[PDB]
Structures are given as C-alpha cells and as structure tokens.
Amino acid sequence: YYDYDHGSLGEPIRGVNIGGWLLLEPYITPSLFEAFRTNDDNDEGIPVDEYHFCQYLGKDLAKSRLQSHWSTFYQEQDFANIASQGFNLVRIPIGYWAFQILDDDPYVSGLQESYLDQAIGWARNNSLKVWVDLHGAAGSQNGFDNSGLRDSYKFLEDSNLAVTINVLNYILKKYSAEEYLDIVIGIELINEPLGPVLDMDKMKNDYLAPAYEYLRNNIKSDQVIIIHDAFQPYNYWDDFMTENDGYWGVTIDHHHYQVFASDQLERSIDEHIKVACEWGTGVLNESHWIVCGEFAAALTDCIKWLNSVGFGARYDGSWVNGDQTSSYIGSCANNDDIAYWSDERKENTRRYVEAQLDAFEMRGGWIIWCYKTESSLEWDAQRLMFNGLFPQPLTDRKYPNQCGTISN
Numbered sequence: 254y255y256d257y258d259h260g261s262l263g264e265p266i267r268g269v270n271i272g273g274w275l276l277l278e279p280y281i282t283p284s285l286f287e288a289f290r291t292n293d294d295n296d297e298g299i300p301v302d303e304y305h306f307c308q309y310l311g312k313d314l315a316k317s318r319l320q321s322h323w324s325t326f327y328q329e330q331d332f333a334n335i336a337s338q339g340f341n342l343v344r345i346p347i348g349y350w351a352f353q354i355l356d357d358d359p360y361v362s363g364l365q366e367s368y369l370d371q372a373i374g375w376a377r378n379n380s381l382k383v384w385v386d387l388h389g390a391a392g393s394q395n396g397f398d399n400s401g402l403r404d405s406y407k408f409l410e411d412s413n414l415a416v417t418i419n420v421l422n423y424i425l426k427k428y429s430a431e432e433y434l435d436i437v438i439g440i441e442l443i444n445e446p447l448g449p450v451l452d453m454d455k456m457k458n459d460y461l462a463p464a465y466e467y468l469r470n471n472i473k474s475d476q477v478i479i480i481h482d483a484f485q486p487y488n489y490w491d492d493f494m495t496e497n498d499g500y501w502g503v504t505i506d507h508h509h510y511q512v513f514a515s516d517q518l519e520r521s522i523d524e525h526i527k528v529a530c531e532w533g534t535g536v537l538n539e540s541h542w543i544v545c546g547e548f549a550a551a552l553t554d555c556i557k558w559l560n561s562v563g564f565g566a567r568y569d570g571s572w573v574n575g576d577q578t579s580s581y582i583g584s585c586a587n588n589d590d591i592a593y594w595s596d597e598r599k600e601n602t603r604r605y606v607e608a609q610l611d612a613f614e615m616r617g618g619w620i621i622w623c624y625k626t627e628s629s630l631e632w633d634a635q636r637l638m639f640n641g642l643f644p645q646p647l648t649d650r651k652y653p654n655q656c657g658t659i660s661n
C-alpha cells in the first residue's frame with residue numbers, strides 16, 4: 254500500500270520512465286530499427302514496432318538481439334544515477350508477451366520477467382519506488398507502436414482480453430506479495446487504452462473491475478492499482494470505484510503532452526504554460542488519487558520517428574497520415590542538437606518544465622517520460638539535466654511560481 258495523497262516518501266512522486274527497454278519504441282532506440290534499412294533512400298523493410306521486429310528477424314535472431322538490448326540499455330548503474338539525481342521512483346513498461354503469447358505471436362517471451370525482477374532489485378538497492386506497468390495488451394489497446402502492435406485495436410476482443418487478463422492476474426499476484434509492497438507501490442492495469450475508440454463499459458466491467466476484485470478479494474493484498482485515464486476528460490473517473498462503495502488504493506494516471514496535435518504545437522510559450530498549470534489545478538477537484546505518469550519537456554514533435562516509423566512531424570508540416578495533414582509552424586532542423594538551440598528556446602523549455610513540475614506536484618507528483626534515449630534531447634531526462642533544461646536539484650527554479658502569476 255501507498256497513500257498517494259499523503260505518501261510515506263514525504264514528497265510527491267518524482268519519477269522517470271524506463272522507456273523503450275522491455276518494450277521497444279523506434280524513436281527511443283532508432284538504431285535497432287535502422288539496422289533493417291537496406292536503402293538509404295527509403296524505409297522499405299524497416300519494422301514499425303516490436304511485433305514486426307520479431308516477425309522479420311525470426312525467433313532466434315530476435316532473441317539474440319533483444320537479449321543484447323535488454324542486458325545493456327539499462328543496468329544497475331542507471332538506477333544509481335537516477336537516485337543520485339533526486340528521483341524517487343521508476344515506472345517500468347512491459348508487454349503482455351513477456352509472460353504469455355498468442356499462438357501466432359512472433360514475440361520473444363519468458364526472458365523479460367528476469368530483467369524486470371532485476372530492476373526491482375536495483376530500485377530497492379537505491380531506495381527507489383516502482384510502478385510495474387503493463388504497457389501492451391494482446392491485439393493492442395491503442396494501435397500505437399508503443400503498445401507493441403501499431404494500427405490494431407482488438408484489446409477488448411474476448412479472445413485477446415482473456416490472455417491479457419491472465420497475464421495481468423499473474424502480475425497482480427506476484428508483485429502484490431508482501432516482499433514487493435515496500436518497493437513496488439503501483440501496478441498499472443493497462444497503459445493508454447484508447448478510450449475514444451474502445452467500449453469503455455466493457456473495459457470497466459470486463460477488465461478493470463475484475464482486476465480489483467482479484468487483487469483485493471482473491472489475492473487479498475493492499476497493493477495500489479494504477480488506472481490510466483484512457484484519454485477521457487478530467488473527472489471522468491470520479492464515479493468509478495468510489496470510496497463510498499468501499500474501493501480504495503486506486504490511482505488515476507493522467508498523461509500530459511502538448512505536441513501531438515497542430516493546434517497544441519501552435520501555442521505560444523505563455524499558452525503552453527497556462528495549459529500546463531491548469532493540468533495541475535484541474536485534478537485538485539478529482540475524486541481519486543492521481544499522478545502524472547507521463548509528460549515531457551518537448552514543445553515540438555520533431556524528434557525522429559516520434560510519430561512512428563515512416564511519419565514526419567506536424568511542427569514543420571512534414572506529417573501526413575491518410576487524408577490527414579499538417580501545416581508548417583517552425584523548423585525541425587537539428588532539433589535535438591543543443592548546439593543549434595537559441596537562448597530563447599532554452600529559456601522556453603526550462604520555463605515549460607518548471608511549470609509542469611509545479612503543477613503536477615500540486616497533487617500526487619510526476620514521472621517524466623524517458624530517462625534516456627539514443628539521440629533525443631526533448632525526450633531525454635539525462636540530456637535535459639546535463640544542458641540545464643531540467644532542474645538539478647529537482648526543486649531548483651530559475652522561474653519560480655509561474656503558476657501563481659498568470660493573467661495576461
């Protein structure tokens with residue numbers, strides 16, 4: 254158990270996402286996917302997600318490459334660094350296939366759990382809390398490449414849901430045992446299910462509710478469950494698993510970004526800040542504990558493959574999907590190279606980061622998306638800190654109380 258509104262840490266959650274480790278994401282580790290390029294002029298043959306990364310290589314080759322990646326992308330050293338920087342928690346995404354695969358799944362399985370356990374040990378070793386996050390469901394819960402399978406939305410299909418549920422129960426049972434309660438203070442049932450295109454009622458009654466029942470009445474543990482907001486507006490979950498009905502230990506995970514839509518990318522720095530501050534004040538009125546499980550310093554969607562393999566960026570109007578387009582806003586040239594960042598851009602990012610931190614710390618805390626990437630700056634906590642764009646110590650402020658001074 255962990256009281257997110259009055260945490261034993263004596264401070265709000267200040268974590269980092271161990272992204273792209275146990276679940277591959279092209280923009281985080283582009284070299285793994287660039288390895289498939291045979292023509293420097295086109296993306297033909299390049300897998301768009303881990304599903305196809307495995308399918309293309311075949312079991313044996315996929316296993317050896319993944320093993321090299323899992324054993325090196327993150328090691329205990331990283332967790333020591335994380336702790337040395339003031340963070341108090343790590344969020345670890347893992348796919349359902351790590352534990353169980355569909356008859357026709359190409360995924361490498363049965364090896365990721367060992368690394369997950371090692372990381373939990375490294376976390377305990379360094380006084381870091383942990384969130385075990387089931388980041389991918391059979392058939393995909395959102396069609397994002399970060400679910401493992403892009404452009405598929407069969408999460409709630411009885412056949413798939415049965416597998417995902419069995420895996421979730423395995424996770425709930427194992428990581429809710431007494432020996433993990435002190436370090437693992439949250440198990441996220443499913444990352445970013447795409448609410449708008451899914452049957453919300455089926456997810457609630459056939460996935461979320463049963464999980465709570467299993468954990469509290471079958472396993473009988475006080476472990477806290479994390480429910481992603483499914484992209485629904487604030488207060489949407491207030492009437493779900495309420496305390497009045499005897500439910501407890503339920504935290505809503507809100508993700509916050511301002512780069513995945515043209516109108517958002519068009520905002521001035523002051524508008525970006527006003528929106529960030531409101532993300533914080535808005536949850537104060539919510540009926541459940543809450544933590545911002547993901548946010549970034551990013552103010553553009555310029556980073557290579559951020560919009561998945563084969564797609565450009567809305568920021569410089571190079572993004573197009575089907576009959577949907579984007580329009581020019583600003584340049585994406587040398588986007589992630591600090592040498593090409595103007596003083597204005599540096600200031601704006603630092604301000605944006607501070608406003609977000611202040612806002613999210615109003616209640617529950619935050620977890621920055623991505624401690625490390627191969628070449629990104631906007632999505633890389635390590636690089637942001639090195640370049641003075643992310644606070645060190647975490648309470649350091651060059652632009653204090655921005656959320657307390659807004660009007661114009």
Ligand SMILES: *[C@@H]1O[C@H](CO)[C@@H](O[C@@H]2O[C@H](CO)[C@@H](O[C@@H]3O[C@H](CO[C@H]4O[C@H](CO[C@@H]5O[C@H](CO)[C@@H](O)[C@H](O)[C@@H]5O[C@H]5O[C@H](CO)[C@@H](O)[C@H](O)[C@@H]5O)[C@@H](O)[C@H](O[C@H]5O[C@H](CO)[C@@H](O)[C@H](O)[C@@H]5O[C@@H]5O[C@H](CO)[C@@H](O)[C@H](O)[C@@H]5O)[C@@H]4O)[C@@H](O)[C@H](O[C@@H]4O[C@H](CO)[C@@H](O)[C@H](O)[C@@H]4O[C@@H]4O[C@H](CO)[C@@H](O)[C@H](O)[C@@H]4O)[C@@H]3O)[C@H](O)[C@H]2NC(C)=O)[C@H](O)[C@H]1NC(C)=O
Nearest residue numbers: 329330332367368369370371372373374375376377378379
């Ligand atoms: C920071 O956080 C880190 C993350 O948690 C944390 O990491 C941990 O560090 C410790 C310290 O170094 C590591 O422990 C040492 O591990 C050494 C290697 O052991 C591993 O290999 C064993 C054999 O290898 C194969 O195993 C597979 C599977 O069984 C077989 O199929 C193969 O055939 C191999 O076995 C053959 O070969 C063997 C060697 O020739 C032979 O003996 C065997 O008969 C076969 O022929 C493997 O057995 C072992 O796995 C477990 O084995 C049994 C249960 O199956 C138990 O012994 C343990 O459960 C053991 O678990 C592992 O080790 C510890 C438990 O001690 C556990 O925490 C780990 O998570 C891991 O699962 C491993 O896979 C060991 O050689 C070494 O043993 C020492 O022996 C000394 C002499 O007796 C003792 O004085 C030492 O105390 C120490 O441990 C003793 O002996 C047993 C260890 O086997 C203990 O059970 C016993 O209580 C006693 O203490 C260490 O155990 C650990 O691996 C590592 N874990 C992770 C997550 O990576 C780090 O410690 C943290 N640091 C800080 C600052 O806190």
Ligand SMILES: *[C@@H]1O[C@H](CO)[C@@H](O[C@@H]2O[C@H](CO)[C@@H](O[C@@H]3O[C@H](CO[C@@H]4O[C@H](CO)[C@@H](O)[C@H](O)[C@@H]4O)[C@@H](O)[C@H](O[C@@H]4O[C@H](CO)[C@@H](O)[C@H](O)[C@@H]4O)[C@@H]3O)[C@H](O)[C@H]2NC(C)=O)[C@H](O)[C@H]1NC(C)=O
Nearest residue numbers: 453454485486487488489490491492493535537538539540
């Ligand atoms: C201050 O805090 C109070 C709460 O103390 C807020 O007041 C209301 O609090 C309710 C808590 O139960 C909120 O209920 C939710 O309302 C959602 C609907 O809101 C929008 O509706 C439009 C039109 O339908 C949609 O387009 C939007 O996407 C939103 O959904 C519900 O979706 C949500 O869940 C529902 O559950 C029922 C029962 O299972 C289903 O039948 C239904 O289909 C749905 O799944 C839930 O009921 C309520 O939103 C909230 N008031 C609103 C509308 O903001 C104050 O709002 C807070 N003050 C502010 C504004 O900051």
